[PDB]
CSV table of C-alpha atoms and ligand atoms in Angstrom, one decimal:
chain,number,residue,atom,x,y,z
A,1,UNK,CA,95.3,-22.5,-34.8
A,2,UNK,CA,97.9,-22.4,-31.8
A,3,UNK,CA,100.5,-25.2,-32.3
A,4,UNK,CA,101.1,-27.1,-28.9
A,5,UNK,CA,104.1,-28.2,-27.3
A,6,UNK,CA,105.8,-31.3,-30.0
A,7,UNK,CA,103.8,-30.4,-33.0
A,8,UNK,CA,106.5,-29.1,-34.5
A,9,UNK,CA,110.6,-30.5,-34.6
A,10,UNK,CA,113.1,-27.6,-32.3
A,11,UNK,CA,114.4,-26.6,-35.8
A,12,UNK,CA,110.6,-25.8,-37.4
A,13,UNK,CA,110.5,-24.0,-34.0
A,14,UNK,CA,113.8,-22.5,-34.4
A,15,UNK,CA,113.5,-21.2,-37.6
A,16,UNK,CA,110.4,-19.2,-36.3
A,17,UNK,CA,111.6,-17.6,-33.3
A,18,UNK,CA,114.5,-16.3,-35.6
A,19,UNK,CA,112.1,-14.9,-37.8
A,20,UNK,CA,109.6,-12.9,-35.3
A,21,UNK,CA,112.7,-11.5,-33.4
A,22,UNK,CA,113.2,-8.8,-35.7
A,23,UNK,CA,109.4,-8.5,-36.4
A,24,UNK,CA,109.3,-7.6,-32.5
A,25,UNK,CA,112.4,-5.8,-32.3
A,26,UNK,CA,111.1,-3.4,-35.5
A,27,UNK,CA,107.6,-3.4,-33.7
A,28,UNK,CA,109.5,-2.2,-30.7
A,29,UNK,CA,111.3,0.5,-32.1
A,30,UNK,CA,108.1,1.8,-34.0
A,31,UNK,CA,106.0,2.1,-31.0
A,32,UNK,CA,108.4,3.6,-28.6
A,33,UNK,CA,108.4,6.5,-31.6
A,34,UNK,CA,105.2,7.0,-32.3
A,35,UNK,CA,103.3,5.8,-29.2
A,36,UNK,CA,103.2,7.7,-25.7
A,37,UNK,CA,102.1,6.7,-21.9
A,38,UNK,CA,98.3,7.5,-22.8
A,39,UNK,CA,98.8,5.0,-25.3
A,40,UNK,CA,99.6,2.3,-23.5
A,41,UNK,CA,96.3,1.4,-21.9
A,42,UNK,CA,94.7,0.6,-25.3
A,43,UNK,CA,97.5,-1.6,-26.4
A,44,UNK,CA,96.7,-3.7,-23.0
A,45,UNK,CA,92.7,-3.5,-23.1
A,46,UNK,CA,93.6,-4.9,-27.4
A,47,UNK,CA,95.6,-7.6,-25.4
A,48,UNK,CA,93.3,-8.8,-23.3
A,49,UNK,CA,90.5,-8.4,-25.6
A,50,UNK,CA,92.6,-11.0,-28.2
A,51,UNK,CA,93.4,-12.9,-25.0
A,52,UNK,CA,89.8,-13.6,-24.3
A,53,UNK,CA,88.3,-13.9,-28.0
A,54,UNK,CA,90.8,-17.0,-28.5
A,55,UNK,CA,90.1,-18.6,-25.2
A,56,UNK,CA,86.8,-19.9,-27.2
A,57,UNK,CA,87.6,-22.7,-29.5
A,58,UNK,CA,87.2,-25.9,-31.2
A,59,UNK,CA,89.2,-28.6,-32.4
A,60,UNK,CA,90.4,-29.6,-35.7
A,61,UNK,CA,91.0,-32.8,-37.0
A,62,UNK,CA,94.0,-33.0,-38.9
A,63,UNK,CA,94.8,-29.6,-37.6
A,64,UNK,CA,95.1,-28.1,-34.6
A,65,UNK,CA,91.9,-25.4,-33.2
A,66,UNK,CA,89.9,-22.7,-34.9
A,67,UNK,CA,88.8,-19.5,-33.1
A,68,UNK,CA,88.8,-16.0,-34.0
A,69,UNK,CA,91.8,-13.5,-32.7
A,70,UNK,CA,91.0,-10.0,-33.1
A,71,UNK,CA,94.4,-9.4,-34.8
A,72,UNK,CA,92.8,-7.1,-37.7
A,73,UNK,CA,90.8,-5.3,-35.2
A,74,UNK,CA,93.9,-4.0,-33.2
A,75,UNK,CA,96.1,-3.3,-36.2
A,76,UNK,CA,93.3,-1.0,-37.6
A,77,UNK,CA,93.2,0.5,-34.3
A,78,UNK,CA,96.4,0.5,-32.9
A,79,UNK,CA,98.7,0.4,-36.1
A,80,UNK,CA,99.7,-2.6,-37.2
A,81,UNK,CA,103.3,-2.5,-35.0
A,82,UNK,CA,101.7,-1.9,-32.0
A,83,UNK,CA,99.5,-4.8,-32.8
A,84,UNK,CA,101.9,-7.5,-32.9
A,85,UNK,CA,103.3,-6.1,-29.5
A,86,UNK,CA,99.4,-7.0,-28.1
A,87,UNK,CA,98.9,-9.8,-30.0
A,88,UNK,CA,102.5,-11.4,-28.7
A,89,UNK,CA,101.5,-10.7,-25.0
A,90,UNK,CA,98.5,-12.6,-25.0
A,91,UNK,CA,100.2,-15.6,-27.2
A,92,UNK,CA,102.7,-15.5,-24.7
A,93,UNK,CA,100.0,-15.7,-21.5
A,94,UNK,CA,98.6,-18.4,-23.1
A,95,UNK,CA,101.8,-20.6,-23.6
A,96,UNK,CA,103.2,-20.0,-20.2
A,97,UNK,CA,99.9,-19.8,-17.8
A,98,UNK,CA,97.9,-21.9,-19.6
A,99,UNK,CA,99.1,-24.3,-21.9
A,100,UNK,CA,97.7,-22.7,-24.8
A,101,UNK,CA,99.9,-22.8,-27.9
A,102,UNK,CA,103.8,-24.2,-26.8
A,103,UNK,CA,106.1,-22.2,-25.2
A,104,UNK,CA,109.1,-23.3,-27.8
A,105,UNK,CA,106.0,-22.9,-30.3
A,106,UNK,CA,105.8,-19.3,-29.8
A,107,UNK,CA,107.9,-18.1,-32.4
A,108,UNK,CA,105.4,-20.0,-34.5
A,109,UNK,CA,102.4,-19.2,-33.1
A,110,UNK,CA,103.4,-15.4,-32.8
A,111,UNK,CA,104.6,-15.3,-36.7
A,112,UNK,CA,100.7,-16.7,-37.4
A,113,UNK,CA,98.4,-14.5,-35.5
A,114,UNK,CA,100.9,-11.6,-34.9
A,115,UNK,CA,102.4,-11.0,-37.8
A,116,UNK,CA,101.1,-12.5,-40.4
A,117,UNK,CA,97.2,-12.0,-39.5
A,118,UNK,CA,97.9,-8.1,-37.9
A,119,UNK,CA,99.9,-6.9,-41.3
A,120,UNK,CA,97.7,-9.1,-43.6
A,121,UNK,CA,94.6,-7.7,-42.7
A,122,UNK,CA,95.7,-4.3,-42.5
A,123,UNK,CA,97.2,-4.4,-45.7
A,124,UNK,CA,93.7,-5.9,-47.3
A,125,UNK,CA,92.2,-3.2,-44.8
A,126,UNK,CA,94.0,-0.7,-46.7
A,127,UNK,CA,93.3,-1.9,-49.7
A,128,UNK,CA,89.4,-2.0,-49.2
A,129,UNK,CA,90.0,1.8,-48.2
A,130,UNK,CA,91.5,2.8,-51.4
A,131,UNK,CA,88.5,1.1,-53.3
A,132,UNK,CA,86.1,3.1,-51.3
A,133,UNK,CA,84.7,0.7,-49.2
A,134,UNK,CA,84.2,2.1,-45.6
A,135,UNK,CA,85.9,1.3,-42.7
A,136,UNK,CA,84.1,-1.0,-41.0
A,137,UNK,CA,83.6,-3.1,-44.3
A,138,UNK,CA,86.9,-2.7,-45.2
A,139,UNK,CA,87.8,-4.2,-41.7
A,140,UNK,CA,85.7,-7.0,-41.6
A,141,UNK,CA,86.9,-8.4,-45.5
A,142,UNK,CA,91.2,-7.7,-43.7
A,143,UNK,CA,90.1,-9.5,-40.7
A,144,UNK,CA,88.6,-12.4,-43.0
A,145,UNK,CA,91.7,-12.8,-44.9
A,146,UNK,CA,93.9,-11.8,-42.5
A,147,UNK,CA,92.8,-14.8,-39.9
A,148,UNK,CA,93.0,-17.1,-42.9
A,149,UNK,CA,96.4,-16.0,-43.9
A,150,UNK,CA,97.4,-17.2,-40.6
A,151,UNK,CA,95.5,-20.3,-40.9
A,152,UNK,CA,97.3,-20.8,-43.9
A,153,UNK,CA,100.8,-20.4,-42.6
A,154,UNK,CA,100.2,-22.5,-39.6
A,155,UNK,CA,99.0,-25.3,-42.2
A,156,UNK,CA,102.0,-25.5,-44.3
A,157,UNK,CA,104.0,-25.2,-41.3
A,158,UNK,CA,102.4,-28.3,-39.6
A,159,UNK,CA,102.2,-30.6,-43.1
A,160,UNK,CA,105.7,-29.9,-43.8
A,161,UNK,CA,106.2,-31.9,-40.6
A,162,UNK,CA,106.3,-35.7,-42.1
A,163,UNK,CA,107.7,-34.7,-44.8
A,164,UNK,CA,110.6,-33.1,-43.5
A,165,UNK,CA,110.9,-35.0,-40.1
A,166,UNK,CA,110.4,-39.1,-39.6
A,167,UNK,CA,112.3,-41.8,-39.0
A,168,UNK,CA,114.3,-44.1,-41.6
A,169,UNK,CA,111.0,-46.1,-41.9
A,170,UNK,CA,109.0,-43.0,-42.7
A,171,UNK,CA,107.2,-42.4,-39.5
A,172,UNK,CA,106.7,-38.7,-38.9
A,173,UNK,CA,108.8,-37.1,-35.6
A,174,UNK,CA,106.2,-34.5,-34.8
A,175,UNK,CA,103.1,-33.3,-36.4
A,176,UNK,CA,102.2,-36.9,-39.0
A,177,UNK,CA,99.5,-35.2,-41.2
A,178,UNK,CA,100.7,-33.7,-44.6
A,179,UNK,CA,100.1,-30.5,-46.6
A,180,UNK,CA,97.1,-32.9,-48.0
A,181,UNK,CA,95.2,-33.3,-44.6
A,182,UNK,CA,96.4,-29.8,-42.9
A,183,UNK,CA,95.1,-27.9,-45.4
A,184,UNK,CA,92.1,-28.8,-46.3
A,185,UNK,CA,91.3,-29.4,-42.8
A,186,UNK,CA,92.9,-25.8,-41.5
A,187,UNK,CA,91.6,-23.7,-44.3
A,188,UNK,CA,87.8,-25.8,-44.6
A,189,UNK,CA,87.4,-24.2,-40.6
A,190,UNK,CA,88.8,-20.9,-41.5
A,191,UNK,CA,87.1,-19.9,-44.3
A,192,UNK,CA,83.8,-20.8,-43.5
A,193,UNK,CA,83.5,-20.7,-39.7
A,194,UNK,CA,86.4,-18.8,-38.0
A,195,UNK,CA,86.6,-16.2,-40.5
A,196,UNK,CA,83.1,-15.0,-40.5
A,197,UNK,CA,83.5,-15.2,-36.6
A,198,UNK,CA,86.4,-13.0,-36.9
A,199,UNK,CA,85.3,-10.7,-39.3
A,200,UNK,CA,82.0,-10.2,-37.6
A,201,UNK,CA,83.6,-9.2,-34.5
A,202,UNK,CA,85.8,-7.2,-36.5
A,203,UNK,CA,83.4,-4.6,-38.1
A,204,UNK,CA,81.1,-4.3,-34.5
A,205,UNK,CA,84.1,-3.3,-32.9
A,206,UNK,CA,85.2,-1.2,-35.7
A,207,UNK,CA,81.6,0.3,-35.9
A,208,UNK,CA,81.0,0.6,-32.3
A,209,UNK,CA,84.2,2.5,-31.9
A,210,UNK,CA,83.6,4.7,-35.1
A,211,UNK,CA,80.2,6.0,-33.6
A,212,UNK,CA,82.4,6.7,-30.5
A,213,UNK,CA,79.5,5.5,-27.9
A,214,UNK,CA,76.6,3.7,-29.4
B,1,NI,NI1,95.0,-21.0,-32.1
């Protein structure tokens, strides 16, 4: 789902750097409380783990890519907060090393698949819990939802593009396929393919992790 570089106008893009600043400044400020040193290694092994799950996609006509994320897996594990932190870093390695998503796309990008997607899922996660589902259930059906939340967002964000931004004779400035086309295209990949990706690798991890070695 990463946006490149020109898919969205510098105010789309401005608009969602200004909302994920205090996202990460909260995220911050929750994991420098409740996380120490030992800690950290596990936010950066969920970081590269993300990283490398999203490095294997396809493209989407009338969208952008599909691909899975991990971003339910590491807010299960590593608290939602501390999540977004991971999921950021490897957005941001992407964008600047390897051209992967936009770099004044990232507060986009970011806002998809580390907050929306990480808090999302956890919340469905959560939810699942409370019905009595176990955990790695529960954390396959939040990282289902969860990836297509994101998937969603990313969507609306890339058909509101025409619509909002063209030219006096109506040509679009950035991204020219409406709500209509991103959509259907966007969600059609996420809810059939991506998701099940996602939520597959999801509860093995989850399960693999729960049985602490085997
Ligand atoms: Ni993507």
């Amino acid at each position: 789902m990463h946006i490149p570089e020109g898919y969205l106008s510098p105010q789309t893009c401005a608009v969602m750097g200004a909302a994920m600043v205090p996202v990460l400044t909260v995220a911050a400020k929750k994991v420098n409380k409740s996380f120490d040193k030992k800690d950290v290694p596990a936010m950066a092994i969920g970081s590269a783990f993300a990283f490398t799950i999203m490095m294997f996609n396809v493209p989407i006509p009338g969208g952008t890519t599909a691909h899975a994320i991990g971003a339910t897996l590491l807010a299960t594990t590593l608290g939602p907060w501390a999540a977004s932190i991971s999921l950021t870093l490897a957005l941001f390695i992407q964008a600047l090393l390897f051209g992967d998503g936009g770099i004044l796309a990232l507060g986009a990008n970011s806002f998809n698949m580390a907050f929306i997607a990480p808090f999302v899922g956890y919340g469905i996660y959560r939810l699942m819990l409370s019905l009595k589902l176990n955990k790695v259930l529960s954390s396959a059906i939040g990282g289902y939802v969860g990836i297509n939340a994101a998937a969603l967002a990313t969507a609306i964000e890339l058909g509101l593009q025409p619509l909002l931004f063209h030219t006096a004779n109506g040509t679009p400035l950035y991204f020219p396929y409406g709500l209509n086309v991103a959509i259907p295209a966007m969600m059609f990949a996420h809810l059939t393919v991506a998701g099940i990706v996602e939520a597959v690798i999801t509860g093995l991890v989850v399960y693999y992790l729960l049985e602490h070695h085997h």
